């Protein structure tokens, strides 16, 4: 669910999902069009694609369970939708973690008209 993914992002990064990632660039949160601005945005693009692979699942509301096994996120057994949503969100959090070194506040609240360039999943 949206709230769980926000917790997973805070644990990984130390940044609150809202407002650090909720409006970042051309793909994070509401959005998803044009050429991703940077590596963090590419994380959101992949995440957006990952959700798109699951048209009959509801990632905002569906709650999954996960644990930590060496500080590592480990998705636990639930429904097939919940399992698949978890793996999507786990990849995004890790991706954000991996790219904190290039995170830029200038891409926060990025303008929609500046998101141009087709990019398929």
Ligand X SMILES: CN(C)Cc1c[nH]c2c(CCCO)cccc12
What is the Cα–Cα distance from 97 to 114, expressed in whole angstroms? Answer: 26
Taking the least distance from each CB to ligand X, the nearer of 70 and 121 is 121
Closest approach, Cβ 85 to ligand X, in A, equals 13
What is the Cα–Cα distance from 82 to 75, expressed in whole angstroms? Answer: 9
* Interaction site with ligand X (CB under 6 A): 2-3, 5-6, 9, 17-18, 21-22, 28-29, 44, 47
Closest approach, Cβ 118 to ligand X, in A, equals 20
Taking the least distance from each CB to ligand X, the nearer of 13 and 83 is 13
- Strand ranges (DSSP E) for 17-100? 66-68, 73-75
Sign of the four-CA dihedral 83, 87, 89, 93? positive
- Is 89 known to be catalytic? yes
- Is 38 known to be catalytic? no
Q: Which residues are tagged catalytic?
A: 47, 89
């Amino acid at each position: 669910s949206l709230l769980e993914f926000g917790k997973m992002i805070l644990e990984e990064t130390g940044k609150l999902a809202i407002p650090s990632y909720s409006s970042y660039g051309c793909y994070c949160g509401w959005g998803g069009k044009g050429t991703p601005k940077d590596a963090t945005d590419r994380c959101c693009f992949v995440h957006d694609c990952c959700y798109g692979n699951l048209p009959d699942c509801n990632p905002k509301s569906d709650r999954y369970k996960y644990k930590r096994v060496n500080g590592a996120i480990v998705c636990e057994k639930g429904t097939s939708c919940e399992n698949r949503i978890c793996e999507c969100d786990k990849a995004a959090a890790i991706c954000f973690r991996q790219n904190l070194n290039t995170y830029s506040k200038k891409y926060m609240l990025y303008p929609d008209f500046l998101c141009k360039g087709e990019l398929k999943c």
